[PDB]
Design an enzyme around this catalytic site. Structure first.
Site: not given
Ligand code: CA
Ligand code: CA
Lengths: 527, 196
Positions: A1, A76
């Site tokens: 974008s 994460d």
């Molecule tokens: Ca990460």
């Protein structure tokens, strides 16, 4: 974008400008929904993603806004240490913890018409859902989203942005958005503002954040960083902001996903366009969007490298001479201005094959064994930073190729690319013109499921937003033009008849035309 | 045109884009959901199914693993209700109105399905279900989470591990730093440090 916001000083009229180009693919019904909202103290025209109770690309009475994917580090993966005697137990803060269990049922429509029933068990840890197993190493991988459980607070934040009337209220809304996006702001007072929004965790400084984090409990997030630490700026002194999912600021990191933020970055197309002009208007922004949409992105850094090499030897190699003349006259676009079905610049076919040959020779003998994982990095659609540093002789951590070996590769790739075109097309670059790549507004979007039947119409492939808004915040009201393909109304009649507004904007999109941006009810009625 | 669904005026321009004129936000956001349902009901249904992991019920086994992924990482209705309950009461109420608007067209279309249910509903032999505020949050999660979610940390681990076993740790570490850098100081930026 991609997005652009122009401050008052950089705009010809003295009005702030805004350009939106969200890239969410091309489907029918479209991924965007355009609407006009008008209640007391709230007047806003624009589009948002289908299903969203807010506008993301457009303007209210006071401000224009857009967004681009931030690519910030909000996900994460944690490496859970499993109990060798019990695979459903992991070690966390000194004691074995039981995984959370959940059995799900899935009904599957059989091709015969009947339906089957499938059962699956999903596991959860303190960090989140288990996404993968490395049982041989007594490891389970869980996924933590910084925005876990706050998606509704992000909706609320986007709605507050719709209701906002000034920078203060817009920034407050930005400060509540928990997911990783870039937000862009322009208002009728001439102000522009940029925010890399999201809740970005405070990580342990004892881990390498490009790799999973040990889940034993010593390397846990310690909350989220204050919004003041998020990249942001109000009225930057350069007078504008451009973005194509690139890095917000010099020292802002995104851990494992740095591959999108390298010296070679496709945003260069927008930087070049703005820096090559003085004050600008919406017409200019449109010409820069045209450039980006049809640019062979490798040309910015790699066509100069190629020419430099070939010019060293073009006296004795007539083919190198002819190539350098053709490369230099080429405007770096793969476009079809005459609509004959072939890209206009024949040398673009050569450059494409040259690049492919060059990328292969640079890394095959070293990364080939891992190219299933690394090709998407070294030949990334946003840029080829490592390849550029090798060919340009710039410092790298591993000595991939010397500058002399790099030149030999550039030459070998040229000889091979040219030899293939001679054998299949001939010696004149006009004959090399390649058939244009086409696409359709199909049935299946990035959510990877079918949401309709799509559209038949083929249009030329464009590296372009799925919609475009061009807005100028004039003292009276937001003004400009936009396009939201394929069409407003995704309804197909039972008998197969497409709604008249199912794809009546595809011609506008393919021919770089637009419809007026409507804000004044007086204008809305006569539209 | 210029219709009047309840106390909201809806002007549809020459491209079919609806322009809503309401006397308060409660009416406005109900009409917001209604017009979106008029235009995109089957798309809304399938997007909601995407989040709920129930696409396979319609389009078959090809979407089983996507459904499983969606549910693995997804939320329960009660979990989504807890999110709505943490919003400002006005925000929650408007999201409810938005869902009530979608539900209004659902109810209207099942009463005249041959003219108001799109062809995909007839071809696949099922009907749209009514909507709840939680479902609205589901339509946001299915599309917006895509741009936040990735497992590149796992790819990186596999890259370094396969480089290490073939080339040795010293060489793999250097190769990986060139592949996935800590911070390319020359990458183009949107703002300069002086602009923070
Ligand atoms: Ca990460
Ligand atoms: Ca042509």
């Amino acid at each position: 974008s991609n997005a652009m916001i122009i401050g008052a000083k950089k705009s010809k009229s003295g009005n702030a400008l805004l350009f939106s180009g969200p890239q969410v693919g091309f489907v029918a019904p479209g991924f965007l929904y355009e609407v006009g909202l008008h209640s007391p103290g709230f007047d806003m025209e624009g589009s948002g993603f289908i299903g969203y109770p807010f506008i993301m690309f457009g303007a209210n009475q006071h401000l224009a806004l857009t967004a681009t994917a931030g690519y910030g580090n909000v996900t994460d993966i944690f490496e859970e240490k499993l109990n060798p005697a019990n695979s459903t137990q992991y070690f966390y803060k000194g004691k074995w913890r039981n995984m959370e269990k959940r059995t799900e049922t899935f009904i599957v429509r059989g091709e015969d018409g009947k339906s089957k029933k499938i059962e699956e068990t999903f596991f959860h840890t303190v960090h989140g859902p288990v996404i993968s197993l490395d049982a041989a190493a007594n490891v389970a991988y869980s996924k933590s989203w910084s925005f876990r459980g706050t998606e509704a607070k992000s909706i609320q934040a986007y709605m507050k942005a719709n209701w906002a009337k000034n920078v203060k209220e817009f920034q407050q809304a930005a400060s509540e958005f928990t997911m990783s996006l870039n937000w862009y702001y322009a208002d009728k007072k001439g102000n522009i503002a940029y925010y890399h929004v999201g809740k970005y965790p405070i990580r342990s400084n004892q881990i390498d954040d490009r790799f999973p984090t040990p889940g034993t409990g010593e390397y846990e997030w310690k909350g989220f960083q204050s919004f003041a630490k998020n990249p942001q700026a109000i009225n930057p002194k350069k007078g504008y902001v451009v973005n194509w999912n690139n890095k917000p600021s010099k020292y802002w990191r995104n851990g494992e996903y740095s591959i999108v933020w390298g010296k070679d970055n496709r945003v260069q197309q927008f930087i070049n366009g703005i820096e090559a002009r003085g004050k600008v208007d919406l017409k200019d922004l449109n010409e820069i969007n045209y450039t980006a949409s049809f640019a062979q992105l490798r040309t910015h850094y790699f066509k100069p490298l190629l020419i430099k090499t070939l010019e060293k030897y073009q006296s004795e190699n007539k083919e190198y001479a002819y190539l350098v003349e053709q490369l230099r006259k080429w405007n770096n676009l793969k476009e079809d201005k005459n609509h004959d079905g072939y890209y206009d610049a024949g040398v673009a076919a050569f450059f494409d094959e040259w690049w492919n040959n060059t990328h292969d020779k640079l890394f095959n003998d070293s990364l080939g064994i891992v190219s299933d994982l690394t090709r998407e990095i070294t030949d990334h659609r946003m840029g080829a930073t490592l390849a550029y540093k090798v060919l340009s002789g710039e410092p790298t951590n591993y000595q991939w190729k010397s500058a002399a070996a790099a030149e030999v590769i550039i030459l070998e790739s040229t000889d091979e690319a040219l030899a293939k075109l001679h054998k299949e097309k001939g010696e004149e670059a006009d004959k090399w013109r390649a058939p244009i790549k086409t696409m359709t507004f199909g049935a299946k979007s990035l959510i990877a499921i079918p949401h309709g039947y799509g559209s038949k119409t083929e249009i030329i492939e464009m590296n372009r937003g799925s919609e475009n808004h061009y807005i100028e915040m004039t003292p009276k009201q937001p003004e400009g033009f936009n396009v939201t393909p394929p069409g407003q109304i995704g309804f197909i009649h039972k008998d197969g008849t497409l709604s008249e507004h199912y794809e009546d904007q595809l011609s506008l999109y393919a021919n770089w035309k637009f419809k007026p941006f409507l804000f004044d009810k007086k204008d809305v009625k006569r539209a | 045109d210029q219709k009047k669904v309840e106390n909201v005026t809806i002007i549809r321009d020459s491209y079919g884009v609806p322009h809503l004129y309401a006397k308060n936000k409660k009416d406005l956001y109900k009409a917001y959901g209604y017009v979106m349902a008029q235009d995109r009901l089957f798309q809304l249904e399938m997007f909601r199914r995407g989040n709920e992991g129930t696409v396979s019920e319609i389009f078959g086994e090809e979407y089983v693993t996507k459904d499983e992924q969606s549910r693995r990482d997804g939320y329960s209705d009660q979990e989504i209700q807890t999110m709505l309950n943490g919003l400002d009461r006005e925000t929650k109420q408007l999201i409810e109105q938005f869902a009530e608007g979608i539900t209004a067209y659902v109810n209207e279309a099942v009463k005249a399905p041959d003219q108001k249910l799109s062809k995909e509903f007839h071809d696949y032999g099922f009907l749209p279900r009514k909507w709840k505020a939680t479902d609205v949050v589901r339509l946001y999660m299915v599309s917006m989470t895509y741009f936040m979610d990735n497992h590149q940390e796992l790819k990186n681990a596999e890259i370094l591990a396969r480089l290490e076993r073939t080339y040795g740790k010293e060489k793999a570490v250097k190769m990986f730093d060139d592949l996935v850098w800590k911070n390319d100081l020359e990458a183009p930026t949107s703002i300069q440090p002086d602009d923070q």
